Subunit: 160 residues, 2 copies
């Protein structure tokens, strides 16, 4: 599992290294983009865009609007909060607990939703998207490791 | 990689967890023992035994003495510090010669515990006969990070 081991080391060094620099969500998004090989969006518990990075353009009006608003609409924020654990490979044909009216979030590509949890609290949501390649268990290991680090840093920014 | 994913979830929950209870190294050692399936020893940067858990007896008089003293001798503490990154599957055939009695029996993996960019201690793992693979290292290094998190938290208690 050597590639996975190397990739966990890159994420893990985020937890263990330095601890000096201020929090930078765009930088974290970029790191996870390259390690996981996926679009990365970091959303707060209240639906605010904290940071993102894209390596594969996907046509999605709902995500585009979120980017423009730097915020999900209230209903979408609520339905993300209602995802209690990692939900992967969501698409147009998905089988999930988003109301049909809000499944335009999965218009195109494949989406994985990973709750960000820190200090026993829901701190936000890590959303990953790819044009065509499925997320496998290795991808989920890295996504969940990344989510935990982002949670760590959301707390730091709270206390900054 | 379903078994690995489940095991990372158990370790990871330790990070994303409450943050209520005071730090407990014996508990962390017991968790890692079950998740990784290995003996677990948590040692501070100064060679003090912080916690440990055993699931397979290995006759090793050097390790037994450390457990009795709750501390490594100076020379061993120094040579653990000089281990800059994970070193796995150490045994009699693989530290100066005089201090390789640490690897008398079984297979040993040494994982530096790093937090705040600093060397906070060492996680030592041992097994009677089964080799540590990359999955084992992923879990060991995840566990090491959590323990480092807690050594810092304990420093600010």
């Amino acid at each position: 599992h050597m590639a996975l081991l190397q990739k966990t080391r890159i994420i893990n060094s985020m937890l263990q290294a330095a601890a000096g620099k201020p929090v930078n969500f765009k930088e974290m998004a970029e790191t996870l983009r390259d390690v996981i090989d996926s679009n990365i969006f970091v959303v707060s518990r209240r639906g605010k865009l904290l940071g993102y990075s894209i390596n594969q353009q996907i046509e999605n009006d709902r995500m585009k609007k979120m980017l423009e608003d730097r915020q999900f609409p209230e209903e979408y924020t609520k339905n993300l909060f209602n995802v209690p654990e990692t939900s992967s490979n969501l698409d147009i044909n998905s089988e999930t607990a988003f109301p049909v009216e809000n499944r335009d979030l999965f218009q195109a590509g494949l989406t994985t939703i990973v709750p960000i949890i820190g200090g026993g609290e829901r701190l936000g949501t890590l959303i990953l998207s790819r044009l065509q390649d499925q997320f496998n268990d290795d991808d989920l290991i890295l996504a969940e490791y990344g989510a935990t680090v982002v949670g760590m840093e959301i707390l730091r920014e709270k206390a900054e």
